[PDB]
Each structure stands twice: as C-alpha cells, then as structure tokens.
Amino acid sequence: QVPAELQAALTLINNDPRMRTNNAWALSADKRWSLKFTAELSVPCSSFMPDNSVWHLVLWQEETLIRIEVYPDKSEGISATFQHQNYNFSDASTREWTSGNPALENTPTVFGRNLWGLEPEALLDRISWRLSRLLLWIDAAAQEKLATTGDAVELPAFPDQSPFTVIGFSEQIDDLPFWASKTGEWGFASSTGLPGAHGTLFLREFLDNKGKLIRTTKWSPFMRKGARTTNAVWSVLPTLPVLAPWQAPRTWQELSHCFAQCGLSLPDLFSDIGRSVRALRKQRAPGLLLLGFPLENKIGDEPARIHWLALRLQPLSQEPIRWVRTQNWAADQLRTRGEAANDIRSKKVLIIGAGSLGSMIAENLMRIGVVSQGILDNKAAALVEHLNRILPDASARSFESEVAKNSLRQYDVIIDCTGDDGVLKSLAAFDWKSEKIFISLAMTWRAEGLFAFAASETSFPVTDASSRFNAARADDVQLWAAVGTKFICRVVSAPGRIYEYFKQMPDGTVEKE
Amino acid sequence: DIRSKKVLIIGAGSLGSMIAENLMRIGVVSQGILDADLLQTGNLSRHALTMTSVGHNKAAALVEHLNRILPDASARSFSCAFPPESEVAKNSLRQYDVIIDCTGDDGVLKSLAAFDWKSEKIFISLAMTWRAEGLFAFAASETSFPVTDASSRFNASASPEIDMDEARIEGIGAWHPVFPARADDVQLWAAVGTKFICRVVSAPGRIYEYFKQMPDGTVEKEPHEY
Amino acid sequence: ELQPQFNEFLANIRPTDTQKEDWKSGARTLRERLKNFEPLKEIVVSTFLQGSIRRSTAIRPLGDKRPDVDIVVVTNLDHTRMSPTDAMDLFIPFLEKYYPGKWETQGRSFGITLSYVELDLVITAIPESGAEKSHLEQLYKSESVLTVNSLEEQTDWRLNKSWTPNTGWLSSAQVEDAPASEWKAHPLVLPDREKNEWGRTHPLAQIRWTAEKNRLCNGHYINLVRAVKWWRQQNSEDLPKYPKGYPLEHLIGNALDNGTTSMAQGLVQLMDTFLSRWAAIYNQKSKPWLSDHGVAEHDVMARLTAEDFCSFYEGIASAAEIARNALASEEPQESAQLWRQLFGSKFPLPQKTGRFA
Ligand SMILES: Nc1ncnc2c1ncn2[C@@H]1O[C@H](COP(=O)(O)OP(=O)(O)OP(=O)(O)O)[C@@H](O)[C@H]1O
Ligand SMILES: Nc1ncnc2c1ncn2[C@@H]1O[C@H](COP(=O)(O)OP(=O)(O)O)[C@@H](O)[C@H]1O
Ligand SMILES: *OP(=O)(O)OC[C@H]1O[C@@H](n2cnc3c(N)ncnc32)[C@H](O)[C@@H]1O
Ligand SMILES: [Mg+2]
Ligand SMILES: [Mg+2]
C-alpha cells in the first residue's frame, strides 16, 4: 500500500499551480519510490529547454539517510547538461529516468538568499524545499543565467572519470605570456610517477615537434630524483573545449566539432603526430593528450593562467573518451586552507637542534609556508628528508671554513632549540657580519613551562637572556611547539627585545607572564 | 587506566589523525580508525601525513603510519562509513570501550544516537570553531549517546559567527570554499583534546568544557555545571 | 472547535526532549548495570518503567524542578520469609557503587538524582510459585514490558509476549491482547509506607486499561488528563491539596465516555458526567468508592477526606460553567479567551552552530 507521506507529497504536487501529475507512486526492486510529474515555466522558453519538461521524483535510503533527488525523464525530459547539474546520460536499462539530477543544494547568485533559506528535516518539508529549488533552477537555466558575474568558474562534469588517477602540473601567472604565443601548436611532454603514492603522476618538462626542450618545471628535491618518460602530447587551444551550454564532449566526434568551432582540425593534428612519431625513432608512442587553454577564476575577469586537461589517447569514431583528472600544484594553490603572512614566508630560517621541539617547529613552519629552512645539528639529514617529503615546494638544507660561515650568514632568522648554554656562548662569539633576528626557546623541568626570548641585533646578547631565564609526554612537547611557532610568527611580524614566560595549568589552561 | 582500553576514532581528517598519533605515542595501543575518504595534496597543509600517502584511503594510511611508531602498536582500519551495513562490522564495532567523534558532522551524531551498542560506553565529542578560535569538548558515559544535550551545550557556548569573507575557494576551477585553520592551531587543540580525553577517562561522567585561545598566546576555559 | 490552538497548548504543556532522552538513557543504563551486578544477578528478574511517564499523562514541572520517573524492580524473593526492610537493604551496595552521593532512601522507595530527571524505583516480588511463576517471569521479560517508549509513540502496543515493535520505512500483523486468564489474577507485592508489611500492586493492568481507553476514545484520553492536571496546577489557590496524581487520573478515566470526537467536547462531557454522578454523594458530604483496575479489592479514594472531595466538586462546577459558555461561543477570539481563563497564558490566541574538524 502507498504510505501516507507519499500521498501527502502527491497532494502537494497537485496543489502547486506550476506543476501537474497523473501517475501514482511505484516501488522498485531497489526499494526506490518514484513519481512522474511535469513542470512549467514562467519565462520564455529556449531551444535547449522546453516549457513543459517531465521529471521523476525519486526517494530511497542507503544506511540511515533518506535521499531525495529529481531526475529527467528518458523520453520527454531535457537532454542538455547545464551548470549545477550532473551529466545527463541515458543508458540502456529498465530505468525510466536519466542521470542528470540538478544539484539543488548549490546556491547560484540568481537564487535569492531569502528564497534559499535552510533545509528542513521532515520528509514533506524537504520535498517542498527541493521542488521550489527545482523550479528556480529550471527557470534560471531557461534564461541561461545559471552562471553570472561574480560566480566561480566551475569546470564541466566529465562523464566516466576514473576516481583514482590524477595528473599534477605547476602553472603560475608568470607563465601565461610564454604560452600565449603558441596558440595552435603541438609538441611532446614527459611525466614521472610519484613514489609511494597510488595512481598519481606529475608533469616534468615540455618539448617541441622535433624533441627540443623549451620549459622545465621546478619540484622539491624528493620529486626531482625520478625517471622521466616522454609519453604525452600537448596542444594549446584558444578557449575551454565545452559544448553548449556547459556540456563536456563525450565522443570523439563532439571533440572534433568543438575543434572545428574553435578553428582547428583534429584529424590534421593526429596525422601530424603520427608522421612525427614515424620520423623520430626514439619516440615509441604517446599515451596521453593534454589540452591547454587560458582560464579565469571568476566570471567577468580576464584569464591569468593556463589550465591543462588530459584524456587517454580515431577523431571520427563514436567511442567514448576516457578522461583523466588533473590538479594544479602551484605554490599559491597548495595552501588555500590557511597560510602564514608573506613577511615570514620570504625569510631564510636557520634552526639549531634537531631534537624534540626543533623537529616539530620545523614541521609546523614547513606546513604553514616557510619553505627556506636550514637545519644545523643523523638527525639533521632525516629531518631534512622528512621535511622535503611534505609538499611539492619544500626546500630544506642540511648541515670553521669561511665559505661555510658565509653560507650560515646568508640567513635571516636564527632560532635556538637546544637548551644548552655553550651554544648560547658560541652564538654570542660568532661573527654574523650583519643584522639578524635571534630567538631562543626552552622548556622547564617536567615540561611545565616555556622560556621565550627574542632579539634583533648583530650579536646575540647572552647575559640578558640568562638573567631573564633566572628571573616528557608527547602532547606537552606538541603544545609548546605550537606556542613557540605562534611566538616566532609574532616576533617576525614586529622585531624587538621581547621576553615571555608561559605556564600550563592542571585544568588545561596556559598562562603568560 | 586508559592504556588498557580499546579506543575507536571516527574521522581520520585533521584533528583525528593528530589525536590518534598522540594517543599512540603516549601508550594507547589498541585503536580503530573509521573513515571512507581519499587523501589529497591540499589536505597536507593541516595533517599528520605526507605526500607518500596521497590517493589512499585516509583510514588505511593513518593505520600504517600509526603501526610504524612503536613495536607494541596494534591498530585496525575500517573503510566503511558509519554506520556499517554488514552485521559482522557492527559486531566488530561493539567490541570497543571508548568512542571518540572527530568529524564535526551532525549526521554522525544522529547515527551514534540511533546505533545499538548493547552495553555501556564512554562517548567523547571534539570539534573546533570558525577560524579555530575555540574548541568544543563533550563527554558522557551511557548506553546511548545523548545528542540533544550535546547540541544544546554547543549552541549555548559563545563562539565566533561564520563570515564568508574569510572563506577562500579551494582552488582554481572549483566552487566550494574551505574553512580557515593553520597547522599550529590544530596541533594546540589536539594536545588540549588529548589531555581532556585522559581526564575524562580517569573520572567518567557528564562533562562539558569550552576552550578559547587569546592573541597573547594564552588559553582560557569556560566549564559548565550540571 | 479551535483544534489547532488545543494542539499548541498540549505541545506547550508536554515534557521537553532533553528530559525525555535523559530518562530513556537513565532507565536503559540502570537496567544494564543491574543486570551486570554479580551479587544481585540471580535475585533481579526484570526492570521496567511505569508511572505517568509510561502512560503519557505527565506535565512539565514549573521552574527548574526535575520530573519524577517511576521504575519497578521485580525480584524472585520470597516475601513470606523476608521483611521489606531486608529486601530494600539488599540494594544499598549497588547504589553506593554506581551512584555515589546521588541516591537517597525515603518511604518505600529509593530516589536517584540524574542530570535533568529524578528516578524513583520500588522493589517488588512475585507471590506465585511453580509453573505460574515461570509464565509470569516469561511475560515480564518480554518486549512489551521492557520497552521505554510511551503509549503515545506506540499506538500499536499490546500486552502480549508475542508482540514486536512494528517499524516501517515510512509508515505488520496486529497481535491482540493476551487473555485475562494469564495475567489478571496474578498481582505483585510491594512494601508499604512504613516498610512493615507487603501490599498488593498490579500496574500492567493499569497500563493496558489506559491504552485501551485511549484507543476507544480516538487518542484523546491522555491529552484530557494532562489538560485537567494543568488546570488543577493553575487554580491551586482555590483548590484543595488533594486529589492529585493517580487518583485524579482515575476520576478522569471514570468520568469519560467512549467515542470522543474533539477535546472541547470531551472536556464538557467529562465535567458534566462528573457533576451528574457524584451529586448525591456531594450533598451527603461523603466520598466515592472506586475499585482499582489491577486489584479489585482496593479503593483508590482511600486516603481522601470528604471536605477535599466537596471542594474539588465546587471547583469542577465552576470549571464546567466556564467550559460550557466557552464551547457555545462562535467568535474564535472570545472562545479562545474563555479557554485561557482556565488553562492560563499557555493557551495561544488565534539554530545550528558551526563545528569543523
Ligand atoms: N492511590 C493509588 N492507587 C493505586 N495505585 C496508585 C495510587 N497512587 C499511586 N499508584 C500507582 O503508583 C504509580 C506511581 O505513583 P505516583 O504517586 O508517582 O503517581 P503518578 O501518576 O506518577 O503522578 P505524577 O503525575 O504526580 O508524576 C502510579 O502510576 C500508579 O500505578
Ligand atoms: N511507586 C509505586 N509503584 C507501584 N505501586 C504503587 C506505588 N505507589 C503506590 N502504589 C500502589 O497504590 C496503592 C495505594 O498506596 P498507598 O495510598 O500508599 O497505600 P498505603 O499507604 O497502604 O501503602 C498501594 O496498594 C500500592 O500497591
Ligand atoms: O575537519 P575535517 O573535515 O577534515 O574532518 C572530517 C573527517 O570526518 C570524516 N567523516 C565525516 N563524516 C563521516 C562518516 N559519516 N563516517 C565516517 N567518517 C566521516 C571525513 O572522512 C574526514 O576524515
Ligand atoms: Mg510519577
Ligand atoms: Mg513518584
């Protein structure tokens, strides 16, 4: 029997002025309740979307959550893929609906803030919310105003993209002019597999038609030590290869059509690639095709960077295209989740002591942005390798003679984490030949407190630090490492003569004097 | 008292990985990690792992890293999402004594409330605020997890409001933003959470505490009296 | 008949969700702890929830006062040999261990203070022997007795050992009540006020009768009981201290007639029937005799004085006059104000925080 809430939902659909339905609910073998209904428009219709579109409201439950989704009808529904919507593909199955469910949760600018509101918890209220959002979505898509000024440029959904393989590249703002003059040209490229990762590769160098280097990408020392294999082909396009309105090409014929629209020829490119492969005996066969194009970050802005798309590599065939996901591993694209200020990220930092506090402070500094670090203390070598295996833009250096003394003098911030007085005396007795910032950090007995000392002079004042000083479990060390990192950031922000003493309390609080 | 307990951690993201590493380093050897996502390069800005674990399941990589710590470690990984579907997985989950939630998701709280544990457990909930300015700490010792009380306590505390200006987009060619938090804040809150867990395990009961960090580097605490 | 306003009033006078989850979790935890205790492993047979909480006839305490939750511990002890004091003293170590500094003994029961509620557990024993004891224990260990949901939530609850909670995806066979030959003639024994002798009690019959009466009245009986309790609380100055509690519920249940359509009509009929039935006793200055559902030889109105009954009768007369003039009124606002004259201000007139990890 049809339960009560489904009857209430049917009544709700029937009551709506801009919605009609005749079929009743139906339970599927996969325990999904579906209903067929028709939607109208209050705006002039377009070619891609008719006024009266047929949809399929579907409800099911996976573990403890109840999924509410609306799917287009396989016969009288929309066939194009717009923004804020999955790919609209109809398969040969008993299903009566396609797979192009609009993403009603996402809120475009056209979607009013008051109209969006919040998602309720009751099934009937959730259904009403979803239906209202669907009506707004369909009218906006009819107006072709789903993406407007100020919105982020989201890439189109690519059908059948493997969720395991990723290709990494590094492209910055300064590299745009280099590629701006190569629109319509092609060449070879090489890539290397990430050691220890699962199904990840990254690009290394770019070549030309005859196999001559034109650009190299700079990676961390961990990544640089790898084999390079030329198994890719690149080609620069004027714009993003997207079909109207926002549909990604699915077959080779659609890709060729988009190429012709741009003003290029896929078969000519393939013939040239084959001919050049024949000419060069060293080259075996390319296996990947890379497409480059300028890309904006917001709608209404101008392009400032080059983005690359990959597909597994004919132009006239109707076979589906295999796409591979790509990520930009540039420095400004790595720490969008939180980073330190530019004043400390551009400093060369030397740390004395690879013990407990020093290694944790170095790891925190590397993760927050400071990439130029010198480890002086094997503990130093292991710490340097671990720091280099953290992010693609890490540059850590491990460690009498005048040349070595100058190398040490090249740094800007000197931090002491040894807890030894002889090291303080040696720091005071060393000739730095220029002004530096000196910071000293030390823990007390039983890790109950922390001494923080900072100075900005040509020589390290040891007597004042000793007078200030006179006047374990892993979590304690981690706590003091975090506090010391914040103290270092604050000192570098405003250099001077600063001394502070911190103390931890049994209830879990920390006090400063 | 806590070194002889079996500890289950739900969520192997930022806070969960650091808490698990601290617990493994201080002596707690019987741990179980439950997560069902994949590790990316962006997550490493605030995480306990490196680039050699990119593209793996978070739980499995975290479990291997934990097992590479000390010769007496014994950790297990569950790749499903709470709650599990198979009855065998539920029976395996019911063998743990302390249940720790480090996901920050309300659906997980409701699933915990609706799960049948068949015995008395210790439930601990830890989460951070906007910009990692504070920490929510809740604890209870029952057969079922109280969700309404925890929600009311979270709402009662004074916390920063969410502003979208500070929310940066995750990258070029993407739509969803991310929440701002640096590595040092997460490390501070992981240490505080480990201490809170030890204190609660020593004396179980109905406990709620709210922590706040100050610009000068101090930590203040606001408890609740029941 | 202003039904939505009555629904809002009922939602206002009901216990909150925090207290509800608190007493549910407390009952489950207490049951598990009692089961796992070695000294009382064989003695304890069952632990189930009773009182107005189970029967959905409880109102929200004014202020921050904790609601009363009633629990029953059924044991297999022999009451002919053991005094009530020894039986209650057998449970002291358990309370000292699991509930240090939160438990207190008063009268015939123990009192445990939780975060938001107060438990009130009573020790009882089975007065039967032989296979009858086995059948009674099997009934008392069933899912129908060991459920923590109220009668309002489970409209399909039946006093049967073969009954299971019917849960659907959105909304099977409806088992009926067990024959009276299996449970009606077998009550339980509990201590008295002074813990000197064992009395007789039978709460399962009370729960069954309340459920059946609610079913026959289209789910209006418990709401009427709550409304009358709230009315008594509001007009406390002009009303005697008694009756209150279960005797008041017994009077309300006796007064009602089967086939209730709406709440206002039910209240008017209830007060009219109450005035009609006890007029002769009122003018003779006496009190009624009402037999308990579980034990037929006991009088519920045993500790009530005649003057209390007379004062309650006068208050009921005044409330009946007000309700009678309220029901006939056709203007919604005037009728709502007339209803508010009795029930009080709670009768109406016609945020999720962000956590990251
Ligand atoms: N006079 C009585 N006669 C018979 N049974 C009684 C009587 N008083 C109490 N009981 C029984 O004892 C149980 C608990 O009694 P209690 O005094 O706590 O009443 P109650 O209905 O829970 O009251 P309240 O609404 O004030 O919480 C009742 O549910 C009923 O089963
Ligand atoms: N907490 C309780 N649980 C179960 N039955 C109860 C409870 N309190 C009272 N009763 C029942 O209600 C009846 C009335 O009890 P009461 O008025 O206290 O009489 P007495 O003073 O003789 O004990 C008793 O017979 C008892 O069986
Ligand atoms: O702070 P953060 O977003 O990194 O933390 C989220 C972590 O929690 C895990 N998570 C979230 N929801 C679930 C469920 N239902 N089951 C198991 N794990 C869950 C995320 O995978 C992430 O690690
Ligand atoms: Mg009571
Ligand atoms: Mg009581």
Side-chain angles (χ1 to χ4, degrees), chain B residues 10 19 27-28 32 37 44 47 54 57-58 72 84 118 208:
Chain B
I10 305 175
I19 292 185
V28 177
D37 289 7
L44 301 175
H47 212 267
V54 173
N57 192 227
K58 287 181 178 180
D72 57 341
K118 298 181 170 180
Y208 174 74

PDB file of all heavy atoms in Angstrom, chain B residues 10 19 27-28 32 37 44 47 54 57-58 72 84 118 208:
ATOM      1  N   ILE B  10      36.358   8.065  15.081  1.00  0.00           N
ATOM      2  CA  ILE B  10      35.555   8.256  13.880  1.00  0.00           C
ATOM      3  C   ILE B  10      35.996   9.553  13.219  1.00  0.00           C
ATOM      4  O   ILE B  10      35.846  10.635  13.798  1.00  0.00           O
ATOM      5  CB  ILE B  10      34.054   8.283  14.208  1.00  0.00           C
ATOM      6  CG1 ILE B  10      33.652   7.014  14.960  1.00  0.00           C
ATOM      7  CG2 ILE B  10      33.235   8.439  12.942  1.00  0.00           C
ATOM      8  CD1 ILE B  10      32.223   7.017  15.434  1.00  0.00           C
ATOM      9  N   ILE B  19      45.196  13.466  17.056  1.00  0.00           N
ATOM     10  CA  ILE B  19      44.806  12.856  18.324  1.00  0.00           C
ATOM     11  C   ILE B  19      45.243  11.399  18.368  1.00  0.00           C
ATOM     12  O   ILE B  19      45.762  10.921  19.385  1.00  0.00           O
ATOM     13  CB  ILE B  19      43.291  13.005  18.550  1.00  0.00           C
ATOM     14  CG1 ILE B  19      42.933  14.469  18.787  1.00  0.00           C
ATOM     15  CG2 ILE B  19      42.844  12.163  19.726  1.00  0.00           C
ATOM     16  CD1 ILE B  19      41.489  14.688  19.138  1.00  0.00           C
ATOM     17  N   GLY B  27      50.911   5.770  24.786  1.00  0.00           N
ATOM     18  CA  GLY B  27      50.738   4.435  25.324  1.00  0.00           C
ATOM     19  C   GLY B  27      49.520   3.663  24.855  1.00  0.00           C
ATOM     20  O   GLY B  27      49.505   2.433  24.939  1.00  0.00           O
ATOM     21  N   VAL B  28      48.494   4.357  24.365  1.00  0.00           N
ATOM     22  CA  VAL B  28      47.272   3.682  23.940  1.00  0.00           C
ATOM     23  C   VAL B  28      47.543   2.948  22.634  1.00  0.00           C
ATOM     24  O   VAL B  28      47.712   3.570  21.580  1.00  0.00           O
ATOM     25  CB  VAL B  28      46.120   4.682  23.785  1.00  0.00           C
ATOM     26  CG1 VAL B  28      44.883   3.982  23.264  1.00  0.00           C
ATOM     27  CG2 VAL B  28      45.837   5.369  25.107  1.00  0.00           C
ATOM     28  N   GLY B  32      41.161   1.894  16.722  1.00  0.00           N
ATOM     29  CA  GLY B  32      40.486   1.605  15.475  1.00  0.00           C
ATOM     30  C   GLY B  32      40.021   2.882  14.810  1.00  0.00           C
ATOM     31  O   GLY B  32      39.425   3.756  15.440  1.00  0.00           O
ATOM     32  N   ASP B  37      37.161   8.325   3.014  1.00  0.00           N
ATOM     33  CA  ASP B  37      37.554   9.295   2.002  1.00  0.00           C
ATOM     34  C   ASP B  37      38.964   9.004   1.508  1.00  0.00           C
ATOM     35  O   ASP B  37      39.634   8.076   1.965  1.00  0.00           O
ATOM     36  CB  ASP B  37      37.468  10.724   2.548  1.00  0.00           C
ATOM     37  CG  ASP B  37      36.042  11.182   2.757  1.00  0.00           C
ATOM     38  OD1 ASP B  37      35.124  10.351   2.609  1.00  0.00           O
ATOM     39  OD2 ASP B  37      35.839  12.374   3.068  1.00  0.00           O
ATOM     40  N   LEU B  44      47.256  18.215   3.108  1.00  0.00           N
ATOM     41  CA  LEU B  44      48.522  18.123   3.824  1.00  0.00           C
ATOM     42  C   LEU B  44      48.936  19.431   4.480  1.00  0.00           C
ATOM     43  O   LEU B  44      49.897  19.432   5.256  1.00  0.00           O
ATOM     44  CB  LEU B  44      49.622  17.648   2.878  1.00  0.00           C
ATOM     45  CG  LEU B  44      49.375  16.285   2.234  1.00  0.00           C
ATOM     46  CD1 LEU B  44      50.463  15.971   1.234  1.00  0.00           C
ATOM     47  CD2 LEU B  44      49.291  15.207   3.297  1.00  0.00           C
ATOM     48  N   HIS B  47      47.657  18.314   8.477  1.00  0.00           N
ATOM     49  CA  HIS B  47      47.505  16.868   8.568  1.00  0.00           C
ATOM     50  C   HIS B  47      48.760  16.291   9.201  1.00  0.00           C
ATOM     51  O   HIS B  47      49.783  16.967   9.328  1.00  0.00           O
ATOM     52  CB  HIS B  47      47.247  16.242   7.195  1.00  0.00           C
ATOM     53  CG  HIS B  47      46.372  15.030   7.240  1.00  0.00           C
ATOM     54  ND1 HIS B  47      46.877  13.752   7.328  1.00  0.00           N
ATOM     55  CD2 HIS B  47      45.026  14.900   7.205  1.00  0.00           C
ATOM     56  CE1 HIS B  47      45.881  12.886   7.351  1.00  0.00           C
ATOM     57  NE2 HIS B  47      44.747  13.557   7.277  1.00  0.00           N
ATOM     58  N   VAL B  54      49.254  10.088  -0.617  1.00  0.00           N
ATOM     59  CA  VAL B  54      48.245  10.745  -1.438  1.00  0.00           C
ATOM     60  C   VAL B  54      47.571   9.723  -2.344  1.00  0.00           C
ATOM     61  O   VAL B  54      48.235   8.913  -3.003  1.00  0.00           O
ATOM     62  CB  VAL B  54      48.881  11.882  -2.253  1.00  0.00           C
ATOM     63  CG1 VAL B  54      47.880  12.461  -3.232  1.00  0.00           C
ATOM     64  CG2 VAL B  54      49.403  12.957  -1.329  1.00  0.00           C
ATOM     65  N   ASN B  57      43.134   5.555   0.938  1.00  0.00           N
ATOM     66  CA  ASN B  57      42.099   5.760   1.939  1.00  0.00           C
ATOM     67  C   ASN B  57      42.726   6.343   3.198  1.00  0.00           C
ATOM     68  O   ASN B  57      43.802   5.917   3.626  1.00  0.00           O
ATOM     69  CB  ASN B  57      41.395   4.438   2.249  1.00  0.00           C
ATOM     70  CG  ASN B  57      40.128   4.623   3.057  1.00  0.00           C
ATOM     71  OD1 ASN B  57      39.907   3.930   4.047  1.00  0.00           O
ATOM     72  ND2 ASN B  57      39.286   5.557   2.634  1.00  0.00           N
ATOM     73  N   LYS B  58      42.054   7.332   3.790  1.00  0.00           N
ATOM     74  CA  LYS B  58      42.624   8.012   4.949  1.00  0.00           C
ATOM     75  C   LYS B  58      42.856   7.043   6.100  1.00  0.00           C
ATOM     76  O   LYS B  58      43.911   7.078   6.748  1.00  0.00           O
ATOM     77  CB  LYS B  58      41.710   9.151   5.387  1.00  0.00           C
ATOM     78  CG  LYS B  58      41.729  10.343   4.464  1.00  0.00           C
ATOM     79  CD  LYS B  58      40.830  11.438   4.984  1.00  0.00           C
ATOM     80  CE  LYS B  58      40.880  12.658   4.097  1.00  0.00           C
ATOM     81  NZ  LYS B  58      39.994  13.730   4.614  1.00  0.00           N
ATOM     82  N   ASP B  72      54.970  -2.048  19.877  1.00  0.00           N
ATOM     83  CA  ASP B  72      53.833  -2.670  20.548  1.00  0.00           C
ATOM     84  C   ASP B  72      52.497  -2.147  20.029  1.00  0.00           C
ATOM     85  O   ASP B  72      51.464  -2.353  20.672  1.00  0.00           O
ATOM     86  CB  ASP B  72      53.937  -2.467  22.061  1.00  0.00           C
ATOM     87  CG  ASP B  72      54.034  -1.003  22.449  1.00  0.00           C
ATOM     88  OD1 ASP B  72      54.383  -0.175  21.582  1.00  0.00           O
ATOM     89  OD2 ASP B  72      53.771  -0.681  23.627  1.00  0.00           O
ATOM     90  N   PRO B  84      28.032   1.056   9.661  1.00  0.00           N
ATOM     91  CA  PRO B  84      28.267  -0.016   8.690  1.00  0.00           C
ATOM     92  C   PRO B  84      26.983  -0.760   8.362  1.00  0.00           C
ATOM     93  O   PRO B  84      26.012  -0.740   9.122  1.00  0.00           O
ATOM     94  CB  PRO B  84      29.270  -0.930   9.401  1.00  0.00           C
ATOM     95  CG  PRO B  84      29.862  -0.088  10.481  1.00  0.00           C
ATOM     96  CD  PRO B  84      28.764   0.827  10.914  1.00  0.00           C
ATOM     97  N   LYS B 118      24.550  -2.071  22.848  1.00  0.00           N
ATOM     98  CA  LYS B 118      24.279  -3.244  23.675  1.00  0.00           C
ATOM     99  C   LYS B 118      25.053  -3.265  24.987  1.00  0.00           C
ATOM    100  O   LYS B 118      25.033  -4.287  25.685  1.00  0.00           O
ATOM    101  CB  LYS B 118      24.551  -4.547  22.914  1.00  0.00           C
ATOM    102  CG  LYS B 118      23.670  -4.739  21.697  1.00  0.00           C
ATOM    103  CD  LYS B 118      23.962  -6.058  21.012  1.00  0.00           C
ATOM    104  CE  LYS B 118      22.928  -6.353  19.943  1.00  0.00           C
ATOM    105  NZ  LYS B 118      23.202  -7.647  19.262  1.00  0.00           N
ATOM    106  N   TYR B 208      31.123  18.950  30.183  1.00  0.00           N
ATOM    107  CA  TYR B 208      31.253  19.832  29.031  1.00  0.00           C
ATOM    108  C   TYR B 208      32.176  20.990  29.377  1.00  0.00           C
ATOM    109  O   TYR B 208      32.021  21.622  30.425  1.00  0.00           O
ATOM    110  CB  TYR B 208      29.901  20.381  28.569  1.00  0.00           C
ATOM    111  CG  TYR B 208      30.026  21.403  27.460  1.00  0.00           C
ATOM    112  CD1 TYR B 208      30.348  21.019  26.167  1.00  0.00           C
ATOM    113  CD2 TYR B 208      29.834  22.753  27.709  1.00  0.00           C
ATOM    114  CE1 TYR B 208      30.470  21.947  25.155  1.00  0.00           C
ATOM    115  CE2 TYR B 208      29.953  23.687  26.702  1.00  0.00           C
ATOM    116  CZ  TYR B 208      30.271  23.280  25.429  1.00  0.00           C
ATOM    117  OH  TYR B 208      30.390  24.212  24.425  1.00  0.00           O
TER     118      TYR B 208
END
